[PDB]
Amino acid sequence: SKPQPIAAANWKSGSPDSLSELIDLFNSTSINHDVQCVVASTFVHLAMTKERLSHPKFVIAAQNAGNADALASLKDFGVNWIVLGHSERRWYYGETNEIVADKVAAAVASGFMVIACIGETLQERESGRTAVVVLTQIAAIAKKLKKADWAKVVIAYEPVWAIGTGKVLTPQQAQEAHALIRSWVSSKIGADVAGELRILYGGSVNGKNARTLYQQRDVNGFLVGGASLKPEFVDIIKATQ
Amino acid sequence: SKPQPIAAANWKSGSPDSLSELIDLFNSTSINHDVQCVVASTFVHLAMTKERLSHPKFVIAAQNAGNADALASLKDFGVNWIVLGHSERRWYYGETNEIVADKVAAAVASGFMVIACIGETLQERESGRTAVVVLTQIAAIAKKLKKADWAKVVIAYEPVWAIGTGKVLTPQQAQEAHALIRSWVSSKIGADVAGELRILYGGSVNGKNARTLYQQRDVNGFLVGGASLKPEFVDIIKATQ
Amino acid sequence: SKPQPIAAANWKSGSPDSLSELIDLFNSTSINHDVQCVVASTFVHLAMTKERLSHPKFVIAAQNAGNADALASLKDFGVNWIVLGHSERRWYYGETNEIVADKVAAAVASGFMVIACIGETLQERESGRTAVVVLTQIAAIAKKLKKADWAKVVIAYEPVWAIGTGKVLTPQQAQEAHALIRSWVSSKIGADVAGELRILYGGSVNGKNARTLYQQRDVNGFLVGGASLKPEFVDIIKATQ
Numbered sequence A, B, C: 001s002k003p004q005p006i007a008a009a010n011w012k013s014g015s016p017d018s019l020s021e022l023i024d025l026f027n028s029t030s031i032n033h034d035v036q037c038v039v040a041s042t043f044v045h046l047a048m049t050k051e052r053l054s055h056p057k058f059v060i061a062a063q064n065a066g067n068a069d070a071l072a073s074l075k076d077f078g079v080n081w082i083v084l085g086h087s088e089r090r091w092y093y094g095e096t097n098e099i100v101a102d103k104v105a106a107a108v109a110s111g112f113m114v115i116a117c118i119g120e121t122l123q124e125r126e127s128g129r130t131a132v133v134v135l136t137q138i139a140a141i142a143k144k145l146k147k148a149d150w151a152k153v154v155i156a157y158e159p160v161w162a163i164g165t166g167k168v169l170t171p172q173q174a175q176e177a178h179a180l181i182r183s184w185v186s187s188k189i190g191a192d193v194a195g196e197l198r199i200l201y202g203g204s205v206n207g208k209n210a211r212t213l214y215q216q217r218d219v220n221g222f223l224v225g226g227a228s229l230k231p232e233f234v235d236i237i238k239a240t241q
Helices: A016-027 A043-052 A068-077 A087-092 A097-108 A122-126 A130-143 A147-152 A171-188 A191-196 A207-215 A233-238 B016-027 B043-052 B068-077 B087-092 B097-108 B122-126 B130-143 B147-152 B171-188 B191-196 B207-215 B233-238 C016-027 C043-052 C068-077 C087-092 C097-108 C122-126 C130-143 C147-152 C171-188 C191-196 C207-215 C233-238
Strands: A006-010 A036-041 A058-062 A081-084 A113-118 A153-157 A199-201 A221-224 B006-010 B036-041 B058-062 B081-084 B113-118 B153-157 B199-201 B221-224 C006-010 C036-041 C058-062 C081-084 C113-118 C153-157 C199-201 C221-224
Touching: A006 A233, A016 A043, A016 A233, A036 A043, A036 A081, A043 A058, A043 C087, A058 A113, A068 A097, A068 C087, A081 A097, A087 A113, A087 B043, A087 B068, A097 A113, A097 A130, A097 A147, A113 A130, A122 A130, A130 A153, A130 A171, A147 A153, A147 A191, A153 A171, A171 A191, A171 A199, A171 A207, A207 A221, A207 A233, A221 A233, B006 B233, B016 B043, B016 B233, B036 B043, B036 B081, B043 B058, B058 B113, B068 B097, B081 B097, B087 B113, B087 C043, B087 C068, B097 B113, B097 B130, B097 B147, B113 B130, B122 B130, B130 B153, B130 B171, B147 B153, B147 B191, B153 B171, B171 B191, B171 B199, B171 B207, B207 B221, B207 B233, B221 B233, C006 C233, C016 C043, C016 C233, C036 C043, C036 C081, C043 C058, C058 C113, C068 C097, C081 C097, C087 C113, C097 C113, C097 C130, C097 C147, C113 C130, C122 C130, C130 C153, C130 C171, C147 C153, C147 C191, C153 C171, C171 C191, C171 C199, C171 C207, C207 C221, C207 C233, C221 C233
Parallel strands: A006 A036, A006 A221, A036 A058, A058 A081, A081 A113, A113 A153, A153 A199, A199 A221, B006 B036, B006 B221, B036 B058, B058 B081, B081 B113, B113 B153, B153 B199, B199 B221, C006 C036, C006 C221, C036 C058, C058 C081, C081 C113, C113 C153, C153 C199, C199 C221
Antiparallel strands: none
């Protein structure tokens, strides 16, 4: 049915001591389905996870490449995955649709697997602009890519609009956003490409709600940015079967 | 008498776990006077504090905007406050009086409330240059501002010269530096503007000494960069009545 | 025999609470030989270590200067040491041999003591390129320096190739790399300069293996980037006699 799911930890911080125990936890975890696990981090943790993390299903990922040199030196270091367009990048650093599209394409061209993030704000959601905004984000991405490039691309949907609401997304809300993205890729890139595409849910997820979220037709995993620093990231991985 | 005081936490680091307990502590704190509390941080903690921090007296603040896009995207994210010219920026990053003045003005123009930092080094203090140095710093700030702009400006005095001395400032030393800044604004900008201006003490403060520091005529609060990561930041807030 | 050894902690992260206890540990440590201890960090920890760290043998060091202003403002803050070319800089940020050479020289010119890092990757080691690669790195450094400048220069060898191998270097492997660097400096710069030069081992080190590593002829200490956040950094210091 679905393509290979992805469980991604976006390690954002955390002590070296707790990361270390997390690495042992992951190393000692038996995972019984096909799923690509990812641990994304800044350099200090990356060399740590590279040092002691050893599980056939885990890979490490960068969170940013500053320039051409930073893409190449990262490949030279053993890092083959990179998370791009995530919210810190769009909202604290102010990266535009075009800046993230250009990063996606340049990383693709360097041999990376790319998790590319999209998602609308609260003003946009409330004013009825979700579809235009989100599809404009992925449209800017697609403009800089060839059909082939999509083999190395993963989309993550981040409902940024929900931060500070007190609210978590329903499976219904998540499926709607994912279905919307899936429709666009099918028509514009290809039915084939759309079918192989992993669209990960990037909002607030826990062990409980991940299983119900993953039951939805267009969800192919999670980009997790809180519980990924906790033992329950194991529970999220196991939701992907 | 005084304008509305400000209690500012400049979160510099800290675990997500201890920040989380701090957020509960702040949420459950009853504060019985008019005071604007601020939690300044980098993005990872900001989305956290935005997620779970909910107190009528707290607001969140950024610590830096890299460019025009980073000002705008931050406003779009819900952040209306920014701390600028703080010591990391002047001393590790080497931002000049002019670079911080231009940041202050550009943030003002984007709808931010701005805590702008000034303060002299040890060579400067010891050689008798405090007044010239500090007033030159705020002079560079004022040059890029219109009279109106001051409604969105807060000054924090950071006695950087005291780091490694073993010494903490007396209320007298703090009042002298604050009075000096207040005299300059009154004459150069306006008696009115000077009277509404919040000048925060940004040196080493604890629960004990904050109350005595706040008794001084020209102190309108604190920018705290150590105890703000601890429960006793509550004690500092409560010193502002 | 050997020049003054150096024990360098490259604090990469860590809580303010554990750093604080580490500072007390260092302050209460009696060290009975001539050795220069260094604690390198980003600004938040630097002001902390400057605040409370007081030991006749410790100095603080920066990990990066962004520009001319950032060199000068750092000197103005009291920081006289800087670690450059370390792996995060070459591998996450993509700094070239030339970019690090230019940083070394500019820091030298500003009055800094410089720990300059070199070291080969796994592809390079395995394909028999260690000598050419490592000597090309230090050659690029030397090109931007005058003979005199070397009085302010320290070399650290980082065997980056060993991360993820599961393997730690033998004293033999470390001595070979250090001897290789020592031969180059002697011939190209001077027998004298080579003899005063501190070459630090920058791979994975603990209390046990540091003493045996230090017994080697061309090892003048350690750049430590894991145990430097732990009590056993004391043990590493004490290995340098």
